[PDB]
Symmetry: D2
Subunit: 134 residues, 4 copies
């Protein structure tokens, strides 16, 4: 699971929000620094946290990758993004993780929930997981 020092929303932001990410092999270091092993896949949405919070206010829909859940929200517009795929999944630690870059422009679907006590009071409802992009 996530690093306990972060709320779900804070960990969401670290993984999935980056306006101008460098190459994936570089960009992923910031995430994998907090892990014991390299993440196999990751999408960076080139947007802002505030913007994703606004999408949380869209109509509630079924989560495509969690079909028993209906607290998901789809962006009204396609957003630029950078998807990263781990090239060497046999990596035993995070010192050497190499990623392939996949830029794109897609709608995103996020699950949102009530904030954690450690989350900022500015946003009572926050994104907690990136479900998929379309």
């Amino acid at each position: 699971m996530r690093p306990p020092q972060f709320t779900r929303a804070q960990w969401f932001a670290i993984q999935h929000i980056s306006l101008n990410p460098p190459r994936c092999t570089i960009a992923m270091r910031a995430i994998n620094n907090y892990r014991w092993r390299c993440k196999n896949q990751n999408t960076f949405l080139r947007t802002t946290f505030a913007n994703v919070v606004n999408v949380c206010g869209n109509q509630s829909i079924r989560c495509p990758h969690n079909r028993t859940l209906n607290n998901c929200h789809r962006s009204r517009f396609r957003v630029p993004l950078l998807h990263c795929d781990l090239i060497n999944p046999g990596a035993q630690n995070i010192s050497n993780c190499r990623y392939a870059d996949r830029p794109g422009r897609r709608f995103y679907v996020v699950a949102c929930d009530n904030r954690d006590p450690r989350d900022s009071p500015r946003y009572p409802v926050v994104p907690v997981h990136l479900d998929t992009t379309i």
Copy 2:
């Protein structure tokens, strides 16, 4: 990291050794039962633990997915295998993980090390990680 109740070799066997695995969505349940989240990819080698231990005795080579390591060992023969890929990586828990099946027949490369005290004394050197298949 791995479930602490298992040695590296025991966890290797649970993940990577299955002579007659069912469909991936079924076969992966046995692994994901011990995790909080679904594994993104997994290869089942259709062999036996004893056979992989024997490969550990082959010439020491560089680990293709861990290029600072040279405690890897390549099988002399191709072995039947089942590779599993997570179709819904947005899954938030293990209740609903769906996998695509990829059967094949490939050489395998394992990293091997000295056994853990909790490992059986029958095998002083054991596989501890599946590095890659070729």
Copy 3:
């Protein structure tokens, strides 16, 4: 808690043992699921059925979780074995050493609706040992 277990299953593993051996032996089965030695653990010498019956007692605020009100205190003192970690500086679970502190105390358990994976025959089950008195 190892994810393959429900909270009730993990409660029973840690806290229900009718006739535990010496602590240094008894604790091995718990610590095998851990990276580091558990600092303290109480084995209640009781049965799961006895504890489920306590879940039917008057609900009280949880002494160690004061925002929760689904705790239940045993009407009587029950035999137990408390284990205290002698070497908390231990860096792994290779040689966890425990002091044995047998006793008889009231216990307070939190009880909740069963997990879908739990037996369907007990609708309400103990899920954590809050404290002993």
Copy 4:
């Protein structure tokens, strides 16, 4: 230990604090890296340089890790704040409550070669607090 830290960095976070506040406050910075309240923690009121100097003392067997011989005992007693968890039945870190036990004791630290991520200016660093006397 959070993987972003070296053992020495994590040692300093947990165990080096020159003027710690009351335990219930001081422990918050440690427990934020954890899922559950730490049961006990000693803050040595010292500096990292002081502890590195102790690493130069006579190596001894580690009292709580008896297969290890890279421990070092402080020549003198040092001021400290020991914190004991009052509510170990706490199910999360929302309200960890600690009893304050100020004191002055010898300490025993394990010391090792620095991590590649550690400062290159201290070749040998404290990596774990084995015990206090």
